Assembly symmetry: D2
Homo-oligomer: 420 residues x 4
Amino acid sequence: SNNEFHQRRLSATPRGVGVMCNFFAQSAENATLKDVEGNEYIDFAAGIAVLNTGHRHPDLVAAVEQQLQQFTHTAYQIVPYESYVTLAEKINALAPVSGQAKTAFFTTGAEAVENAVKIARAHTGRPGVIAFSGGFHGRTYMTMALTGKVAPYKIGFGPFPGSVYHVPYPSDLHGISTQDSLDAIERLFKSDIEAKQVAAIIFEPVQGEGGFNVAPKELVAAIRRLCDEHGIVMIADEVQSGFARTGKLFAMDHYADKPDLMTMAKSLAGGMPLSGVVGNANIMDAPAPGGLGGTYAGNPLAVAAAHAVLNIIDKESLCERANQLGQRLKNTLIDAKESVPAIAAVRGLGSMIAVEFNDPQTGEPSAAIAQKIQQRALAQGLLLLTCGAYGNVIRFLYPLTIPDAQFDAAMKILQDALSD
Amino acid sequence: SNNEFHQRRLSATPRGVGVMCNFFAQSAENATLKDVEGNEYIDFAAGIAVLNTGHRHPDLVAAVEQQLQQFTHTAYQIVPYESYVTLAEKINALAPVSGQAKTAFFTTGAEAVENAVKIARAHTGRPGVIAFSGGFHGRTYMTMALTGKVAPYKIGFGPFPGSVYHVPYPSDLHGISTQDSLDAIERLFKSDIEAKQVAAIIFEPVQGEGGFNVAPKELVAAIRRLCDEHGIVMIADEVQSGFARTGKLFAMDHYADKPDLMTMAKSLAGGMPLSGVVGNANIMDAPAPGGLGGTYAGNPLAVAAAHAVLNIIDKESLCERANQLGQRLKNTLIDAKESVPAIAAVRGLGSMIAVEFNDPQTGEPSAAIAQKIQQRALAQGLLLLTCGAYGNVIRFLYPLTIPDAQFDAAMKILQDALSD
Amino acid sequence: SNNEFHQRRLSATPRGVGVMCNFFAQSAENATLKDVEGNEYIDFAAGIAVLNTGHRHPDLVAAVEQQLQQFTHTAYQIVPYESYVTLAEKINALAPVSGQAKTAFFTTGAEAVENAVKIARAHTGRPGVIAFSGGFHGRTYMTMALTGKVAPYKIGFGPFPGSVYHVPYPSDLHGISTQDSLDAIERLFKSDIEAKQVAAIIFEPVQGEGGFNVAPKELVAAIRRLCDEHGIVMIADEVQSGFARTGKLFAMDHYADKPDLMTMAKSLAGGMPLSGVVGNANIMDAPAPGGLGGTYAGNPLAVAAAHAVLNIIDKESLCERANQLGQRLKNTLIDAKESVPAIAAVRGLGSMIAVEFNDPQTGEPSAAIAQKIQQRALAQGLLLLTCGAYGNVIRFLYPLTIPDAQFDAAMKILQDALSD
Amino acid sequence: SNNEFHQRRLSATPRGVGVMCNFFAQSAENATLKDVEGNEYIDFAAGIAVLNTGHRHPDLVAAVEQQLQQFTHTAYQIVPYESYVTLAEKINALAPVSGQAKTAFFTTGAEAVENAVKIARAHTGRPGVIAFSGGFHGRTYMTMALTGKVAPYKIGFGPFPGSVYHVPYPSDLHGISTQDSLDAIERLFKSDIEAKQVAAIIFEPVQGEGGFNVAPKELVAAIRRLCDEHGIVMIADEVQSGFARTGKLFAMDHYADKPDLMTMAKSLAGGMPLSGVVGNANIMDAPAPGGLGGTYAGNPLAVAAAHAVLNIIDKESLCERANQLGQRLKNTLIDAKESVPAIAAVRGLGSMIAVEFNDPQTGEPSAAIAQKIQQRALAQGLLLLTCGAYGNVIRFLYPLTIPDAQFDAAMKILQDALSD
């Protein structure tokens, strides 16, 4: 029963860990999710862009099973294992970072961001960090501070550390330009903190919870220029955009400038708990032995899954397929724009696409319309996710391995849900 | 080759992720670890107290495979699952908290400590946190601040947030008494922060990296009293001491006073990435919906493994067994105390036992002697771990499921390694 | 000799205490300063807007001597005196605060700002403070944090406290509007700190060292509105703009909205060390007995001088006079705007008037032209002061008591320095 | 009327500015204070150790009037003057700082400490500051954090900056030794902050508000040793102990080790608002020009007063007189220990002497007995001050210029007030 267990969950767990759906997952494969009462759903959430290679991809299951017949945990900081080194070598070969790449593995994306910040601070000896409004980087203390949304991520968890600031993110719909961001960064350097006291600038090439806003090329170039000038570490948070989501393996592959450090997680292990930081070896080697670590860091099962994820992305050509699916979804949303004026924007990159809804009679961002369209899709068996500053963005996070027929059915459902 | 991948590792990964052993893991079962060249080792590390049920316990592997046939990740905050709820119910039933309990799951122990601090700050509306010298609570920013050992955990990652203080932990060999701890707390209340601005007091009932120092009953009682008097949340970090290690399920079960919050990890899932926080349901309900979470939180495979772990500790009487094994180890160490004057102390609870070595001609802490015994034991096939402030303590973290014959062989090897 | 003592100065005092002039003061009266070698200077600095009533005003001197016959210091928090209370009563009656006013006295302007922040934190129980870029509020740690100009005030003195942020200040010449300020405040609320975690918003009605930028009426109204909505304390820093400088007694008297707190110093005692905070009695009474104080606070001689200063401002009609002299200066500057293309702006209120210079060919802010005009004037005997974000602003801080003929001589000198 | 003005004072000023006496000062000279109703009091407060040279010493009045006929304020950072340089040279010639000295002047002692910390931070590039429990250093934000007494100086003004810690001050009565302090410093280095991240260790040679505890020679030597070893700036806060109070010109003259920086105020100008920092020239020169300052800093009248105070201390042999008067008061207090069992301790240095009362029927610190003696002596026309962690200590801060007959009358009054 989904109601019995709804009450059991509300009684056993705190209200702080909120849950979107009131049905309980029973099984899942690729992009199909069945609950405990037999209802099937098309998963356009992918565990929040974690299942780019799909629920229980057979190669991932095979790799996890093979490793489960060897060992699940030795603590890498005690007894190492080759799979860690080989995955790090492959990431170094593929990651677009400055200089020669070195990679370390942790467990959660928040741990990856934390360690990127630790590496930057140890390299520069500086305290400051600049992030962007609307950015999301984790739910730990420091990663909350870096996160550019207060409600609900930061309510009641303050005070937050000093030397951490935010500048507005370029958004065409809201009149924020690249030059607005650069002016805010300059106002930081002239009012708040010395440029030679800022250790890192951290940014998402495509903001996840921010509404799938893409960083303009000028912005990435300017960030690279400022970091080169002032000795600041450039951090690209590719935790959500990484691994073929944006049409290339990493979102940063769409830009000429390379960041110094890059954080990875979610789809890195295709449904297993793994994260990592990859970047310039001169910067990564700043902490001494013992300065970085984590007990679950580089979990053998998750690392095997990540090897499988890389091979799947390659052999099934998930980058091109991400581009094709994103184009089809854009076509559907733009065609619907003619009949549903509430659609205010269609943005994104590759298969990282989102639609933002304004009230057609007011012009103000309306979360109500987004919620009701999300209700309609769900009742039709389509699981959609909400994001944005005002919670009026629907982001589409289908697995890149979703079959064509199921994707077309999902487009039909989305068309019927857009139009009342 | 155990030495070609050593160079590969040094070239691909950052220096900051330190590694103790020069060999690479190939397979592991219970307390037996086999490297890529075939060498066998008796694992007295258990992945740093993560494998209380031993490497790949058959029931844990069966549970993980069963779940692997259903789904590995749905993002719990999007789509929940019953295994999370039932595991929370079991932890609530077993946790040493006064009154109604509530449990939330995350992925890493540092994440659990972070959420305990978030819960305490949301409940009290205060900033301050008081921890203990020699304590270890994670490698994230806030958990580094709570950690009471600067070298090597905090070197280069400051500055650290305000309102976080440390008081000395009682140690009979170092002359620190419970009254010393309480006087330092009072000095904090009179010099650094008013008690009504302290949100939590976090402590390990048995210090992990601190040298297995056991908290006196008077200290736990004074902490409970100070917390009730000033409205401070009492946090017990049982990440390393939890799950049958100390002879009871949780170390706090050795004391009459119950904490408000308790953090769990490591052996909770017996080799899978899972952590948690259980406590006073009213305090746990302090953060509003949306304020707590984490993408991997309560990973389904790890949840299944944790169910298995609870059932294994029950059905195989691992508390009783930890008491027996700790007693055998203490007998071996005391029988050696007459031939080895370097044995300065033997401390701990249950099967969380450590031996501290001083120099037999100076009386000063001797880390070299401990490293030499460790060196000798590793050549005989026994993997031992060091800890303590001065690196002069050897901690015994054998899996609780180690067979009697292998344990007795390890005792013989240990007697030889102490022999000089 | 001015040289001998210049070298002795460099040898005995730190380089960090910067000194603008190469001559040493010997005598001073009203707006006339004589160096130790006999050279006379028309003082358009007034000790940085401290000598509004002019150097050694006879009434101030007579009051100071009369008190000197009584006592110079008793420590007010030990033994109080009636001059403190009567000055507090006069300030309470004259301050632009809604409802019952209370006034406390301290010694320096930074001390007044510090106590205003302390009062706001005690009244709200919140950590945060929001200030404006280009603002100056003192050289102590918290007041450096509030100051919105890094160079040179904050170089090497970090890190600075968390929960302290800055927003742009409206300027017609730099493209910053009131709505830009309000949007940045909203971005703070949405990205950095909860609105109901901000204790105060501190602002200058007329930015002193920032270039004499006048706060538009809409900005003050919006600040008042936000404070009423979020329960934030509205702090007006009138240390430099206060006491008849802007054509009315306080700059806030030009606006319909009233602040919760107002800080006073500089011309408060007309050349004696005294500061003060006046505001809402219910808010002022937030700190408990024993929370506010200062050994020198409300020094008797400075309090007598401040009594004299109020009586001088009233009897010699210094508000009206400030308006007249500001109009004469504006006539001179606007007249010169036809021959000097470098004159890009002439702004201010009353006798708080500044001219900003841009390059006549490029249009960029030209600090070199400003310096050039300052040296020309200095060579003719006119002591002028620089300010602005780029050091390209000349501020006119003559004593309001300056004789008309001396003012006209200074205007002629200024006209000569503006062209050739 | 003292009652009518008592009510007026409570009406016009905030409750936070606490006031000890309910009468209002009318006149004062040397050690005799007259209120508005004609009552005379022997001033054993000296405005909280500010009038070592006495109320309105004739030489100080003469210097102040001479300067008042010249100028009262020019803003030293705009136009300098001789008296600043000559006073700095005299301080450099007399101050016991390691190496050749430079001196800067400010206005309040809190500002002096603020600038000492600024100088240490600029010199070292480090954030950390270590202070002592029971120490008092100012009522500003940073000097609050440095202060080691929460009630009443810190209540409601948090949260406080990170990297600021406190260690116990050696006290014979409370069982705190030098080695306790050194162990707490080592615990800071091993649990809280790296030694190479601490910019300064600030301490009072004789704690003022803490109860006149004298720093033992071993403690000063250990602070000097640790500061030399780790690059930490050693700061002696002699705002209260300076200028012949302790029997030598500065308290540090009783010790063989020299601090790097020394802060001065209070008696520095003998009742006029002045403060200063004197220290090693190389360290003082750390902030770039424009980094240090203050509008009122180095007030000409106060600087003339400081010249006069130095001359008075020399010509009237105030150091020797401080020793003599301290010995006479100690004789009076020890002889009273026989009939007053409440006298638990009589401590101090020179004429910086305090008596600590415990309850003779339980052994508990008694602020009530101290206050009864205070009011008993006040009824007889003798004005005493309280202090201590528990408010149970009587301080004797008579002016050093007090005549012998008045001192003997005060001793008579003190003897009668000690007994019931």
